[PDB]
């Protein structure tokens, strides 16, 4: 009857931080002696290019300000002039036990939820979901700004069985587009491995390494750190990059959001592209939140219409519901 008041789901498909090395293309074979790109602090001089607030001011000080320069100090990460290839590497754990709630109050709700995800994995297992995850590992979507100017990108994925490699995949990440989800052989093999790691059987460890042909001496983008800038001069620098072990890298949540953006089923022009899987499905880029609960397509209403009122959604929306279950979250009333 009533839903669980506390309903938690842990993050399956947990990635690690994506360290960035630099090296020449066709030297991707010996890509372990490659040095990492270090973030530098550089002071820049620019103008007052922001728009002014002409409220409780005077015109003389504002046009004297826009006549005067503006000194900042930002962080930047460059490739060397002897390396036209960025090597972004991370590990990925596919945990297992997908539909199991990590916290649930009602035992009847837990039993009905387990029976619902059991009937789902019985009639339609993790084929399409793992195919979309294998696409988003196969096309280099975790290069957010590092992909838009690349001539060629290549993704090498290695399954680490016990302490050594068991399976090697080598994909061209530009033939596999960012908006379409085709069907190939090696992608289906990677999806079957991801499904076996997601069916509760194993906890699969993969390494993903992406080579990107940017250019000699060009600028790469590690993920920017969030400082809220409410205090005494804590926003004078305006750009701080993420660095782990003296090396520029991308956050774990950014790689997770990058291989998570599989949802091509939302009620607002799904031919645009796949968006990230969120409850009340949100994109921070367009500043909109698709699947509002005024329409009957958010995660919450689909969830307690599936497991409570016994009415299954469409075949594409229960994929989104199970994708939130893999995505993990805190729900309940």
């Amino acid at each position: 009857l009533s839903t669980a008041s506390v309903l938690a789901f842990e993050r399956k498909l947990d990635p690690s931080d994506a360290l960035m090395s630099a090296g020449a293309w066709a030297q991707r074979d010996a890509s372990q002696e490659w040095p990492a790109v270090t973030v530098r602090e550089k002071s820049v001089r620019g103008t007052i290019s922001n728009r002014l607030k002409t409220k409780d001011r005077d015109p003389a000080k504002l046009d004297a300000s826009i006549q005067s320069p503006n000194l900042q100090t930002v962080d930047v990460a460059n490739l060397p002039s002897d390396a036209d290839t960025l090597k972004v590497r991370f590990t990925l754990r596919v945990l297992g036990g997908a539909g199991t709630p990590s916290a649930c109050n009602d035992a009847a709700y837990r039993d009905k939820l387990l029976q619902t995800v059991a009937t789902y994995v019985n009639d339609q297992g993790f084929a399409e979901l793992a195919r979309r995850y294998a696409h988003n590992l196969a096309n280099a979507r975790f290069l957010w700004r590092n992909r838009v100017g690349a001539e060629a990108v290549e993704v090498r994925i290695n399954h680490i069985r016990q302490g050594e490699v068991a399976r090697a995949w080598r994909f061209d990440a530009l033939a596999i587009g960012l908006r379409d989800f085709k069907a190939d052989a090696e992608l289906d093999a990677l999806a079957e491995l991801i499904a076996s790691g997601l069916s509760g059987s194993g906890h699969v460890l993969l390494e993903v390494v992406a080579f990107a042909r940017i250019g000699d001496g060009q600028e790469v983008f590690p993920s920017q750190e969030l400082i809220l800038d409410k205090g005494d001069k804590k926003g004078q620098k305006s750009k701080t990059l993420y660095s782990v072990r003296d090396a520029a890298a991308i956050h774990s949540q950014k790689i997770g959001n990058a291989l998570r953006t599989i949802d091509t089923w939302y009620p607002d022009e799904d031919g645009l592209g796949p968006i990230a899987v969120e409850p009340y499905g949100s994109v921070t880029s367009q500043g909109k939140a698709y699947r509002q609960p005024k329409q009957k397509l958010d995660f919450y209403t689909l969830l307690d219409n599936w497991v409570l009122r016994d009415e299954a959604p469409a075949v594409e929306q229960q994929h989104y519901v199970i994708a939130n279950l893999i995505r993990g979250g805190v729900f309940g009333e």
């Binding site: 506390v6 809220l228 409410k230 805190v330 309940g332 009333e333």
Partner: protein, 302 residues
């Protein structure tokens, strides 16, 4: 509570000679008639609505985002143990020991040190503090005491070290010895090149000892009678006392000649007990040979 009712708390914390008998205004008789000097019905009702809604609870709950953590009972079983954020104000003790009289003690510390007599009060520094602000731009939604401090929980650090602290914290020679032992284990016709390689390896070992004596000349001039003197009387003075901490010739055996033959002897005894292959015994004449070798290279310093 709701921040919009916080106005009423600003009415209840009015220190008109006592705000404790005003918030929970129980010990008052004139204040009831002073809240409304018209009648006793609305005055008593407002008084009980002011003393009542600040001592009232409702229902026990933990709304799905407060933490709550299993604790293992000794035999078996668990408890759920929901933690709640305390209002311990170390923030007052932190702010008053960083701004109030930290300035006076700090100026006494920073312009009175040639004057040995400074002011009779000390201060702390509290390094590596961390600011945690709960309400982002409007901290009133959290609570009232989260508006006195503007967020800013002021967390003390823990921070495990990395092999360096001010309070307190804490192999090519083996390759040479191993290749010397593996070299004198086997024999190929026993010619000049074997003795050349033996002199080569013992030469590398003794210049490694010289490099160890030179790189430990970079520690300090003056050691002391620090313990462990069972092997530390002959090699005590081979690691030189830098000739600068002495300054009046307080040591008489620095140039007596006691150190070099004894250091060569005990070094060759170490090399005897360290290098002993299937040719088991090494012996005393080889000990005297390597002893006089290191002794010549140690008396070569002067």
């Amino acid at each position: 509570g709701n921040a919009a009712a916080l106005d009423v708390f600003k009415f209840l914390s009015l220190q008109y000679q006592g705000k404790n008998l005003l918030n929970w205004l129980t010990e008052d008789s004139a204040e009831a008639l002073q809240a409304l000097s018209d009648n006793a019905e609305q005055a008593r009702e407002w008084r009980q609505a002011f003393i009542g809604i600040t001592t009232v609870k409702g229902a026990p709950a933990s709304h799905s985002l407060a933490k709550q953590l299993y604790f293992p009972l000794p035999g078996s079983g668990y408890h759920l143990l929901a933690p709640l954020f305390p209002t311990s104000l170390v923030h007052h003790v932190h702010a008053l020991l960083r701004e109030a009289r930290f300035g006076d003690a700090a100026k006494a510390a920073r312009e009175a040190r040639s004057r040995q007599e400074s002011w009779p009060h000390g201060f702390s520094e509290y390094p590596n503090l961390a600011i945690q602000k709960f309400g982002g731009t409007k901290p009133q939604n959290i609570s009232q005491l989260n508006n006195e401090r503007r967020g800013e929980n002021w967390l003390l650090p823990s921070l495990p070290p990395n092999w360096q602290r001010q309070n307190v914290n804490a192999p090519e020679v083996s390759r040479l010895t191993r290749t010397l032992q593996r070299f004198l284990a086997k024999t190929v016709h026993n010619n000049l090149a074997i003795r050349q390689r033996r002199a080569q390896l013992v030469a590398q070992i003794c210049d490694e000892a010289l490099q160890y004596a030179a790189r430990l000349r970079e520690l300090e001039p003056g050691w002391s009678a620090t313990p462990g003197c069972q092997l530390h009387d002959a090699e005590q003075l081979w690691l030189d006392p830098l000739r600068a901490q002495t300054d009046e010739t307080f040591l008489q055996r620095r140039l007596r000649g006691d150190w070099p033959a004894e250091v060569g002897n005990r070094f060759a005894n170490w090399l005897n007990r360290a290098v002993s292959s299937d040719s088991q015994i090494l012996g005393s004449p080889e000990a005297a040979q390597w002893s006089q070798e290191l002794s010549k290279e140690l008396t070569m310093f002067k």
